[PDB]
Enzyme design. Structure first.
Site, mmCIF file in Angstrom:
data_model
loop_
_atom_site.group_PDB
_atom_site.id
_atom_site.type_symbol
_atom_site.label_atom_id
_atom_site.label_comp_id
_atom_site.label_asym_id
_atom_site.label_seq_id
_atom_site.Cartn_x
_atom_site.Cartn_y
_atom_site.Cartn_z
ATOM 1 N N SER A 133 0.915 -1.303 -0.081
ATOM 2 C CA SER A 133 0.173 0.187 -0.419
ATOM 3 C C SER A 133 0.888 1.062 0.393
ATOM 4 O O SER A 133 2.001 1.469 -0.984
ATOM 5 C CB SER A 133 -0.609 -0.256 1.343
ATOM 6 O OG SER A 133 -2.807 0.797 0.796
ATOM 7 N N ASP A 179 -10.282 -4.220 -3.581
ATOM 8 C CA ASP A 179 -9.694 -3.327 -2.841
ATOM 9 C C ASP A 179 -10.395 -2.471 -2.409
ATOM 10 O O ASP A 179 -10.789 -1.928 -3.653
ATOM 11 C CB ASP A 179 -7.919 -3.795 -3.497
ATOM 12 C CG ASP A 179 -7.323 -2.952 -2.622
ATOM 13 O OD1 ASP A 179 -7.355 -2.607 -1.517
ATOM 14 O OD2 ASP A 179 -5.858 -3.138 -2.684
ATOM 15 N N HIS A 210 -7.889 -5.820 0.473
ATOM 16 C CA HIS A 210 -6.814 -4.641 0.292
ATOM 17 C C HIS A 210 -5.487 -5.737 1.157
ATOM 18 O O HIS A 210 -4.206 -5.560 0.848
ATOM 19 C CB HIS A 210 -7.030 -3.270 1.313
ATOM 20 C CG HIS A 210 -5.487 -2.677 1.466
ATOM 21 N ND1 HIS A 210 -4.903 -2.263 -0.164
ATOM 22 C CD2 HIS A 210 -5.170 -1.829 1.954
ATOM 23 C CE1 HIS A 210 -3.910 -1.599 0.638
ATOM 24 N NE2 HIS A 210 -3.994 -1.071 1.689
#
EC number: 3.1.1.101
Length: 263
Positions: A133, A179, A210
């Site tokens: 991320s 996600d 995610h």
């Protein structure tokens, strides 16, 4: 002649999908983290030659736990891997990139420190970057800023800009179909599409949230195979891994696959 960086037995699908590579792994906590919050170093005890180093950074709010599984998985194939906690769990991508590079620096430091388990185990000219991320976006910033890096393999990346056209480092993007935090269509896929100068790959996990490439995921065989193959191919110049690195894997778990300039 022979590739000086090749380590370990010839790969198979089974050997790459296994939980553990060929080498025995140990780990230690970094005593005095230099430029980042905390770290754990994973290393092979029996690799047979010096190995490259990989630094891995979590996402916002997250810690080493989220990314820890990569430490043993990569190290057991012949890499020194440092997983970090950031100075603040709320650090943004630019800061995460600085911290990731500071972790690689410290691995180079420890390679020169006679008391360290990794003394003389690292080839400090061969390094790679991974992360989740914002830590994935940080990995791409690292690569853009430090083109001598040999490979990048972020997961569910995000950055405030998706334009990574400057990246010349071989880059594998793991993405997660479902996600909700950094949607593929507005984050991972635009980032992938922006890169025009490099070997690159996109692999999206069906049904993935995610956290689909984090510790405790249910696709460690596939994800671990691809991550290790990519790093072996590009950090070790190891063309034994060219097909594993470049192929569209035959997996029920893959819901988007793209690759360019792979060899």
């Amino acid at each position: 002649g022979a590739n000086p960086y090749a380590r370990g037995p010839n790969p198979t699908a089974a050997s790459l999908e296994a939980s553990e590579g060929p080498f025995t792994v140990r780990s230690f906590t970094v005593s005095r983290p230099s430029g980042y919050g905390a770290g754990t170093v994973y290393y092979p005890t029996n690799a047979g030659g010096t190995v490259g180093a990989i630094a891995i950074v979590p996402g916002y709010t997250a810690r080493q736990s989220s990314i820890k599984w990569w430490g043993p998985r990569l190290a057991s194939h012949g890499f020194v891997v440092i997983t970090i906690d950031t100075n603040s769990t709320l650090d943004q991508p630019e800061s995460r990139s600085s911290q990731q590079m500071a972790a690689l620096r410290q691995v180079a430091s420890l390679n020169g420190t006679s008391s360290s388990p990794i003394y003389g185990k690292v080839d400090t000219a061969r390094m790679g970057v991974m992360g989740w991320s914002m830590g994935g976006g940080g990995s791409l910033i690292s690569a853009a800023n430090n083109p001598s890096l040999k490979a990048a393999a972020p997961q569910a990346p995000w950055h405030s800009s998706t334009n990574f056209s400057s990246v010349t480092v071989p880059t594998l993007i793991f993405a997660c179909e479902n996600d909700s935090i950094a949607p593929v269509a507005s984050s991972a896929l635009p980032i992938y599409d922006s890169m025009s100068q490099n070997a690159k790959q996109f692999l999206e996990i069906c049904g993935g949230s995610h956290s689909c490439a984090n510790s405790g995921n249910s696709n460690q065989a596939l994800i671990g195979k691809k991550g290790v193959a990519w790093m072996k191919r590009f950090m070790d110049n190891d063309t034994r891994y060219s097909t594993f690195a470049c192929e569209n894997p035959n997996s029920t778990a893959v819901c988007d696959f793209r690759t360019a300039n792979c060899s």
